[PDB]
Ligand binder design. Structure first.
Ligand code: HEM
Ligand code: HEM
Ligand SMILES: C=C(C)/C=C/c1cccc2[nH]cc(C[C@H](NC)C(=O)O)c12
Ligand SMILES: C=C(C)/C=C/c1cccc2[nH]cc(C[C@H](NC)C(=O)O)c12
Lengths: 420, 420
């Protein structure tokens, strides 16, 4: 010690690591561009989206959700896709999940949900009991639960996944009229709901299989691409829908389920192609800052309470993580006002019939569009998870599943009791 | 948003994570006690070591070395064991590795070595090329290299590993006389150099196999134990030894290799038994602070330059990681003075004959004490690692290995060329 040169070298080495992200800590990154392929000048006034053939540079970060920096990328989890676009009007961020539904509806429950998916606070091991307790206490997560224990829970790498903003936004015209919008990116080298499964199994002991897949595909000359599509709803038609489009835990039906809810059609916008990887991972990918509050002229947030909370949360989290510490809108009708005020009532945090209707119809649709083996594998995965928790929690889970569907609960209980 | 309660909840959640340790980021912890079993009053004046049957509470943290928080614990790596003992004279820290040798003896090279074992700075993937360049540029790591690619590289969990302080310390008597000492903990449920291999193969996709093993063993009622032993050298006998005991990259021979270096015998001191696990992992294990500078009356550091650098580095690193940011000694002879001044010369950072003698004798001892299959597996592991690097670096590695033994280099070269 003692030597000033050695002290400087060691002190510089000591201050090299920073806190990881609270969620989505493990991930990879790439650079590409977006190109406009269709005309949307009748619903949009965003400069980035006007003019067929226009190109915009973009940077993308893929991630998992629940575990730490060095965790395996082939786990049962939801995946994230964050896109930063450098337009002439500034930076536009699309922070998407690989599925258009979310776990919860009330933002004040967000930390608890996160704690339900982190390792055990005493042993630092995996703990399904907290997750199943949260599910039994918050029925609006049931829909997502049914999704997570199918094959779709473990099906996607960074190239075969899709991305959905999952919120309703507002697109505004210069005359003041606006529409509710939801856009998403469909993978050009991945499956969909109707057809397609995993085609490249990860190595038995590989924790970075998806990162390796993306890096090797980029080095081989292949360029992954996504097709961007949007769904449009008139503000006066929203209060009359069979579901609430301000509820982030529900999706907008594209033609799969539930059958009694009419389809909201989508239209194409453009295409996103990834070209190259980074030169310095820590400086370019690890320190990337994304926020849903990064918006350009012509796009506004809606009255979604989760989106409103996200507008504040991301800059504050980045202040902790990267800090020095180391056109007027036209008015709608009174009925629209009541429908909007629905989201600030005390019943917003209580379950309704739709919270059970959506998972029931997904469970019914699984054998019609995929087959009996898909449903059987869902039952097997759920039983494998449930057979690790104490008996009273098991009975509570059985009751909740019966609230979803009787045959699903009976099958899960019968298969789970044989595994304990 | 806009609710002060929600803002407080989200802001509190946003600040929970802190930066991980620069090294040894992944690990687990436990609590136990140390008990004295033998009399060492003739060489020691430390309060906690005097009196047969005396008990001292202690807290232990086990860890890996190179990878991040959520990485697998069954990787080819060296393991760490940190023991904090709560004595009547203060806190005494034993910060040990699972092997008594280290990679280097010049502290100014420490960060580079660490960077040679971290993931690729551009792709965040495993990069064998950086490791072999360091070995070809720093021959004093060759010894450790030979250790790392044997079975001992992947043999130990947290219960079957041993611990070595690896440095020379000074134990001082009240009259001013002192001795060079090195103490270590031998596992009571693990293998040794001559006998024993792995008996608990980890699961194919388990990243927390060692933590689970320790937690389950503690829950079953089994208490792991270690036997503490010490080796003693008189200061006037150190300058005449065939090796430098102030070189942390060498070990003190206990009877295995090299045959021409006489044995330095050990004597028993006491026993360490682990009893219980933590209640809050983050508050008790993750925020634990260890330092070799935590010393009690009667024990002093030696003139080891690596130890002198570690005396400063640990409090500074803890200041970054956990900070608000989120008896006179007897004089020796002139010959001892020259021998000590040897460690401050310019030739300290250059290889000597011992740097080649130690790994050569380990390679020769492997078949005599473990069989031919051990040596063959070492060759196979080395070839598997070397076959992923460019050809010029491969030739450099072959030339570097030729300086240890010709047969080892030829066998590795043949296997590696067949593998590519
Ligand atoms: C109340 C709801 C939510 C809150 C409070 C929340 C909070 C956060 C926070 C604190 C981060 C870390 C940001 C950073 O440290 O820089 C993050 C990252 C992220 N979130 Fe959310 N989140 C919520 C829901 C969602 C939703 C609904 C989506 C997608 C539709 C989403 C997708 C993502 C993604 C992809 C990232 C990773 C961004 C990156 O890679 O840099 N989260 N979120
Ligand atoms: C020049 C040489 C070395 C330097 C500069 C160095 C530096 C460090 C640093 C910065 C930490 C992180 C401490 C913290 O963030 O709280 C650490 C941890 C650790 N080091 Fe060293 N190290 C060196 C060599 C060694 C040696 C020779 C050993 C063992 C004989 C060792 C064993 C450990 C262990 C076990 C830990 C983990 C402590 C814990 O779990 O809290 N290191 N070292
Ligand atoms: C895209 C895949 C592979 C799975 C989607 C998926 C799976 C399970 C439930 C789902 N609910 C909604 C979706 C996405 C929806 N499927 C018409 C879409 O492509 O807009 C979905
Ligand atoms: C203790 C195990 C299982 C292996 C030790 C080991 C292995 C390879 C090279 C080694 N060099 C020195 C040791 C440790 C040394 N073996 C007499 C001891 O027990 O003090 C060692």
């Amino acid at each position: 010690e003692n030597d000033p040169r050695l002290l400087d070298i060691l002190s510089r080495f000591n201050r090299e690591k920073i806190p990881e992200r609270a969620v989505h800590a493990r991930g990879a990154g790439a650079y590409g561009e977006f190109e406009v392929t269709h005309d949307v000048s009748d619903i949009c006034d965003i400069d980035m989206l006007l003019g067929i053939g226009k190109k915009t540079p973009c940077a993308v970060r893929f991630s998992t959700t629940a575990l730490e920096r060095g965790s395996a990328e082939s786990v049962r989890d939801v995946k994230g896709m964050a896109i930063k676009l450098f337009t002439g009007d500034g930076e536009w961020d699309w922070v998407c999940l690989n599925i258009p539904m979310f776990f919860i509806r009330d933002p004040s429950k967000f930390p608890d949900l996160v704690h339900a998916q982190r390792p055990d606070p005493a042993t630092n091991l995996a703990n399904p009991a907290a997750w199943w307790e949260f599910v039994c206490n918050n029925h609006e997560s049931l829909h997502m639960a049914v999704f997570l224990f199918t094959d779709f829970g473990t099906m996607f790498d960074y190239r075969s996944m899709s991305g959905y903003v999952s919120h309703a936004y507002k697109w505004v015209m210069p005359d003041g009229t606006w529409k509710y919008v939801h856009w998403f990116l469909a993978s050009d080298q991945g499956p969909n709901f109707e057809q397609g499964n995993q085609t490249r199994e990860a190595a038995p002991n590989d924790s970075e299989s998806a990162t390796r897949d993306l890096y090797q595909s980029l080095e081989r000359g292949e360029c992954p691409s996504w097709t961007v599509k949007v769904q449009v709803i008139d503000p006066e038609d929203a209060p009359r829908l069979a579901f609430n489009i301000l509820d982030v835990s529900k999706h907008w039906n594209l033609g799969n389920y539930p059958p009694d809810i009419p389809v909201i059609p989508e239209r194409c916008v453009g295409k996103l192609t990834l070209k190259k990887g980074p030169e310095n991972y820590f400086e370019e990918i690890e320190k990337l800052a994304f926020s849903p509050s990064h918006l350009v002229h012509g796009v506004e947030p809606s009255e979604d309470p989760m989106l409103q909370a996200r507008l504040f949360a991301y800059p504050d989290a980045q202040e902790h993580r990267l800090g020095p510490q180391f056109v007027p809108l036209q008015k709608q009708s009174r009925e629209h006002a009541e429908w909007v005020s629905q989201v600030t009532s005390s019943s917003w945090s209580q379950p309704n019939e739709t919270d059970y209707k959506f998972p029931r119809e997904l469970w019914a649709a699984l054998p019609r569009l995929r087959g009996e083996e898909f449903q059987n594998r869902l039952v097997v995965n759920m039983a494998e998870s449930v057979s690790q928790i104490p008996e009273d929690l098991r009975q509570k889970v059985y009751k909740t599943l019966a609230l979803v569907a009787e045959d699903l609960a009976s099958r899960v209980e019968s298969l789970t009791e044989e595994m304990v």
